[PDB]
Amino acid sequence: MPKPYIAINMADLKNEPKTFEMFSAVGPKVCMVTARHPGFVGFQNHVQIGVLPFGERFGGAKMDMTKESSTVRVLQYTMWKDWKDHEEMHRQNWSYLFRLCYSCASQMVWGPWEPIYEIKYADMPINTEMTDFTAVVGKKFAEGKPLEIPVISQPYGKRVVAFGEHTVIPGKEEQFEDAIIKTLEMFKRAPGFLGAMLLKEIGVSGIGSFQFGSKGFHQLLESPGSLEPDPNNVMYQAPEAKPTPPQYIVHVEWANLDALQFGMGRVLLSPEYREVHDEALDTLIYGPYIRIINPVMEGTFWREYLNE
């Protein structure tokens, strides 16, 4: 393939400018340190901008709430050949990593929380800018491979993502994955559709969530910023935190907020779609809660790996 493993770092921060300033200054440094490991294959950092309302099921929400929200959630995707690589980068580069993610403590409201995911399905294209399409069309014809010419999925904040949260009834996992996967395939008929993938949580990176034992806890709260908590003081292993009921993420990319709204809305507006999707809805404990997120900074080459 290969389908890499995905770690998603989640945090809530003050939606003021000091926050975006720090992002601008250390976001880069952290991603550079994460690239010190050969298992690292790329990333996709998102900033949550809104919530899909579903009519008025969520009246206080809108797809773009950036102008009215007091906090902002980030969702940072790091891709790995093997999820154990992730844990090991965290351990190897702890003094940089930690002193770095602390500088933004003054802005933290919740987090960090870094669950680990495995990919059940993935239909994600290589990101191209509108300037590349002539040569992409020219290369594929040159090798007689027109079917390999994809939609133009623009990188660096020029497309939106629907990030849907689902918790499944135990024993219902197969019906759910099957119905969702087929929904994501039918989504290819929708205009503005840039790809999607089903994600399944297989554990939580305790060290990435700043979750240590009694000792680490204390160095965490007592830290001046220039000393790290003992990284070996993480009391559990990623898999020990695999949750039951099972938890999924239906990640779907769209051209714009309307393509997203009416494309997804398809499982609600098209009888054909709506009947396949109702099966997924019969297996749910929680969901679907859909966050609208923006792929701001990324290393689009993780996709080069996904498609080898």
Residues 154-213 interacting with Fe ion (rule: CB under 5 A): 208
Q: Which helix (H) or strand (E) holds 29?
A: helix 17-34
71 binding partner (options a copy of itself, Fe ion, none; Cβ < 5 to 8 Å by kind): a copy of itself
184 with 250: CB under 8 angstroms? yes
Q: Is 114 annotated as a binding residue?
A: yes
Report in angstroms how near the CB of residue 16 gets to a copy of itself at its nearest: 8
Can you tell me which of 82, 185, 230, 240 binds a copy of itself, judged by CB under 8 A?
240
Helix (H, G, I), strand (E, B) or coil at 87: helix
- Give least dist CB 77 to Fe ion, A: 10
Is there binding between residue 112 and Fe ion (CB under 5 A)?
A: no
Contacts of 156 (CB under 8 A, 6+ apart): 295, 296, 297, 298
What's the rounded Cα separation, in Å, for the pair 44 and 46?
Answer: 7
For residue 20, state whether it binds a copy of itself (rule: CB under 8 A). no
Residue 208's binding partner, choosing from a copy of itself, Fe ion, none, with beta-carbon cut-off 5 to 8 A by kind? Fe ion
List C-alpha distances in Å: 114 to 59, 186, 207: 29, 31, 9
Choose which of 2, 82, 132, 185 interacts with a copy of itself (CB under 8 A): 132
Min CB(44)–Fe ion separation in Å: 13
Which residues partner with 248 through β-bridges?
166, 200
Cis peptide leading into 229, omega within 30 of 0? Answer: no
Least distance (Å) between residue 198 CB and a copy of itself:
18
Measured CA to CA, the distance from residue 28 to residue 32 in angstroms comes to 6
**Whole-angstrom distance, CA of residue 288 vs CA of residue 266:** 14
251 labeled part of a ligand binding site: no
Nearer to Fe ion, 53 or 111 (CB): 111
Is 177 a known ligand-binding residue?
Answer: no
Structure tokens at 281: 């809805």
Residue 130, token pair as written in the block: 């509108």
Choosing from 71, 92, 175, 182, the residue that interacts with a copy of itself (CB under 8 A) is 71
Stretches 1-9, 94-102, 116-124: which one binds a copy of itself (CB under 8 A)?
Answer: 94-102
The token duo for 157 is 């904040």
Q: Which of residues 176-195 bind a copy of itself (CB under 8 A)?
A: 189-194
> Which residue in the set 5, 40, 77, 117 belongs to the binding site for a copy of itself (CB under 8 A)?
40
Among 82, 91, 141, 185, contact with a copy of itself (rule: CB under 8 A): 141
- Near a copy of itself by CB under 8 A, which window of 2-10, 100-108, 116-124? 100-108
Q: How far is the CB of 86 from Fe ion (least distance, A)?
A: 6
**Contact track, a copy of itself, 272-301, x by CB under 8 A:** x-x--xxx-xxxxxx--x-------xxxxx
Binding segment toward a copy of itself, per CB under 8 A, in 1-9, 28-36, 116-124: 28-36
Burial class (CB in 10 A: 0-12, 13-18, 19+), 272: exposed
Task: Say if residues 12 and 110 touch (Cβ distance below 8 Å).
Answer: yes
Q: Is 119 in the site for a copy of itself (CB under 8 A)?
A: no
Cβ within 8 Å of residue 56, ≥6 positions away = none
* CA 223 – CA 243 distance, rounded (Å): 31
Q: Contact residues for Fe ion (CB under 5 A)? A: 208
Residues of each annotated binding site for Fe(3+): 86, 90, 114
